Design goal:
part of a larger assembly; 3 chains; A alpha+beta (91); B mainly alpha (62); C alpha+beta (100); B: mainly alpha; C: 100 residues; alpha+beta; RNA-binding; ribonucleoprotein (chain A)
Chain lengths: 91, 62, 100
RNA sequence: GGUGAACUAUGCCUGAAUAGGGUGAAGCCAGAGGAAACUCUGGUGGAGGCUCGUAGCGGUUCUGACGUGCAAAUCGAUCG
RNA sequence: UCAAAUGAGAACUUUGAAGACUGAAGUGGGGAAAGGUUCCACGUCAACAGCAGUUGGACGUGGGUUAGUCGAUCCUAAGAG
RNA sequence: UAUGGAUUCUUCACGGUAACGUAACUGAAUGUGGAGACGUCGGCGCGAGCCCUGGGAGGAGUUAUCUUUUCUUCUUAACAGCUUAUCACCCCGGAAUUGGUUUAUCCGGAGAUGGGGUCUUAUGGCUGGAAGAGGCCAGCACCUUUGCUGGCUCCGGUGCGCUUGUGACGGCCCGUGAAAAUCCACAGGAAGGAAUAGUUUUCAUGCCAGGUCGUACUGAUAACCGCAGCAGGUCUCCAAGGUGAACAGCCUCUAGUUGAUAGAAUAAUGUAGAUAAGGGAAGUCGGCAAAAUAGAUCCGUAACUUCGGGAUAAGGAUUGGCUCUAAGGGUCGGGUAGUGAGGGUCGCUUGCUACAACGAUCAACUUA
C-alpha cells in the first residue's frame, strides 16, 4: 500500500531539521532524481552523474546540463537565442 | 507478484478454479447459444400464434 | 539379496583348556542377538554354527562383527572373562579368541 | 650561539577496524472506490551526521578504595 | 593437594597420584615494531631470583638461522634534492 | 644449436552465414587499446573450507541394570590432460491478446518471445602427478637392527549452520572516489623474404648458466618500554560443543596454565561483602547512598508536535513437565496398443495405440 503520508522519500530523515528545510530540499531531490530521454534512440537513460552531467546509456549520450534538471530554461533561451539570432545574423 | 495468493495447495485450489471456470464456464457459454437456437423458431410460431390476423386475410384468393 | 552374512570366529582358545563353554556363549547369544528390536528375536534368518572350537554366524539380519564384539564385552564382563581373551580380527568379519 | 613536532597541534600519501537488536525511508505490485483527479486497503521493499546494545571508544559521578599505591596519575562502582 | 626419588639439604629439584582455571573475540597458536644470542646442549650456584632456591633468562662453556623459484635493492605515492 | 612439422609459384593456413576456431601461417616511424591501476554500503545468488550426521569397515572404555554404548582410522601438493559460466555473439523470427521476465521491475519491430547454434573458463569436476606417499590399525620376531606380515584408507547424508572467495543488482555524494613500474596487440607495410628452396620457428620437442643481504629466538605482569622480573603502555592474524537472538552471559572439551614469604589463632579495627520487624526521606542544604523494575507473548496509550515524533507513552494479561492435533516442501509418475527418435533394451495419452485428473517417493523445524 501507500507507505508514507507527506514525508515521502525524505522519511529517511524523519523529525530531523527545521521543517522549512526538509520542505524545500525534498523537491530538489525530486528534481535531481528523474530519468530523461535520449533523443537519438527515443528511450530514456539520462540522469545526473553530477550537477551538469546528464548521463545516458540508451544510444550512449551525456550532456553537461544544469544542476538537477538537465537543461535550464536559460539554456533553452540562449539556445533559441543563439539559434534564432543565428537566424538573425546567419539569417 | 502482488500478494493475491496464500500458499501452494491454496493456489492448487485456485488451479481448480482456473480449470473449473475455463471448462465449466466456457462450455456453459457454448451450450447457452446452442440452446437459444430454434426456440427462436418456437417464438416464430408464437408471433404467428396471435399476427395471422394478417395471415388469415390476404394473398391466395386466386 | 537375502544373503546370510558370514562371521567367522575361533573360540577354541580357552575351550582347548576346558575353561569355557561355547554352547554357553552361543546359548548366551541365542536369546540375546538384537535382531529386529528384541534380542533373541531370531526367526530363521540366522545360522548358529558353533563347534566348541569355531563359531560362525551366517545370518541375513542386520549385523556387524563389531556388534558381535559388543556381545562379547557384556559376556566376558558378565561371567567376567575379560582379560584372557581378545576378540581379534583375522580380517573383516573374521575373529578369534585367546587364552592368556 | 645550539636541539626538539617520537610527546603534543596541523596537512598530505600509502595501509588496517567496527556482535546481536529496534527502526521501515524510497522503489515496485495486488485489491477496492471514484469519470478521472484521486481515495483508501493489502503487500513488496530495505532508508536514516536514526536508536537500543556487544566489541569498541571516552570519562559523568559515588567525592569509592588507594592516598611513601601495581601506579610521579593505579584499582572499584558508575556513565557517555 | 599426596607419595616417590634426588641432594646434608626438597615449600620452592624431578616423576608418578590427585583437583582447579583460562573455555577458543583462549592463560591457544602466532607474527610486526622492539629486544638480541636471550635461542639451544653441558659443568657449575659467588651473587641474584627481598624465606628458600639443589633451579633459572643466575656463573663457566659449547652449539645454532642454508633461497635462481622467499622479502631488500624495481617502481612510484606522500615527499627529497 | 639440432629435430620434426609448418606454410608457400595462392610467396609468408583452414573453415563457419556469422558466430568464431586451431601447432603453425615476416615487418620501420607513427599511433592504438588493454593490463597494472584503486569509493562505500545493502540484499541476493554461487565456489572453497569448517561444523553437523548415517551406514560400512579396523582401535579403545562403560556395563548390579540398561547401554548395536562413549570415543578412534578412513589423506592427496605444485603440476599435466580433459570437463565446466555468468556473460557475450551469429541464423530463423516478427511480437498487441502485448509477451519475455527481479526477491526487489526491467526488455523487446534499433527484432522480443522463442528456436537454432558461436564463445571467455571464473569456477568446479575427472584423471595424472601419486601412492610407494603418508596414515590407520592388526599380527608375529626378539637385547631382536627391533625385523617381518597383513589389512584399511568405503559409501553417505545434512544445512536461513560457521568461515571465506565469487556473480549480478541496488543505495549514497554541491563528497563521485592513486601513481609509476611493466607487457602485449593492432594498425605500419618500413624493410625483407619460396620455387627449389624457404623460413619467422609466438608449432613443437630436444643445450648450458643461475649476484649480495636477511633467515635461530622473545614478542611481553622477565626476552618491548616504562627506573623495576612495576597490576602502566606497546601494531597484525586464526576461532570446538552445550547454552542462549547474540562474538552477550554461563558451563564443557582441545590449546595452555595450575605462579603469587610461609605457618598458628581469630580482638577491636577497617576493607570487601550479605542479612534484617515495623515505619518509610521526617533524615539529608539536598533520596547522597540504597531500594524497586527488567526477557519473551498478547492489550493499551496522554499532551505537544516542526507531523516525522511523542511512544515502549504511560499503563494492563501470560511464561513447568507430558501425551496428542493442525498447517508449513522436494523427486517420480498416471502403458493390456511390444509404443519411439531407435527399428539388454527403449516412453509419453502411455487402457508398430501416436500421444486425454491425479497418484508413487524423499525431506525439514515453524507456528498454532
Amino acid at each position: 500500500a501507500k507507505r508514507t503520508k507527506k514525508v515521502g522519500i525524505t522519511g529517511k530523515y524523519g523529525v530531523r531539521y527545521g521543517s522549512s528545510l526538509r520542505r524545500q530540499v525534498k523537491k530538489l531531490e525530486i528534481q535531481q532524481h528523474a530519468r530523461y530521454d535520449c533523443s537519438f534512440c527515443g528511450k530514456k537513460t539520462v540522469k545526473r552523474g553530477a550537477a551538469g552531467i546528464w548521463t545516458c546509456s540508451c544510444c550512449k549520450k551525456t550532456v553537461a546540463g544544469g544542476a538537477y534538471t538537465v537543461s535550464t530554461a536559460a539554456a533553452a533561451t540562449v539556445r533559441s537565442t543563439i539559434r534564432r539570432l543565428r537566424e538573425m545574423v546567419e539569417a | 507478484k502482488g500478494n493475491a495468493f496464500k500458499h501452494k495447495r491454496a493456489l492448487v485450489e485456485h488451479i481448480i478454479q482456473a480449470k473449473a471456470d475455463a471448462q465449466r464456464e466456457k462450455a456453459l457459454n457454448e451450450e447457452a447459444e446452442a440452446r437459444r437456437l430454434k426456440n427462436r423458431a418456437a417464438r416464430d410460431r408464437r408471433a404467428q400464434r396471435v399476427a395471422e390476423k394478417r395471415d388469415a386475410l390476404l394473398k391466395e384468393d386466386a | 539379496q537375502k544373503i546370510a552374512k558370514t562371521f567367522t570366529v575361533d573360540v577354541s582358545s580357552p575351550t582347548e583348556n576346558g575353561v569355557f563353554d561355547p554352547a554357553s556363549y552361543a546359548k548366551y547369544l541365542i536369546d540375546h542377538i538384537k535382531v529386529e528390536g528384541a534380542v533373541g528375536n531370531l526367526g530363521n534368518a540366522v545360522t548358529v554354527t558353533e563347534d566348541g572350537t569355531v563359531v560362525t554366524v551366517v545370518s541375513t539380519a542386520k549385523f556387524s562383527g563389531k556388534y558381535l564384539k559388543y556381545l562379547t564385552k557384556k559376556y566376558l564382563k558378565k561371567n567376567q572373562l575379560r582379560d584372557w581373551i581378545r576378540f581379534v580380527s583375522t580380517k573383516t568379519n573374521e575373529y578369534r579368541l585367546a587364552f592368556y
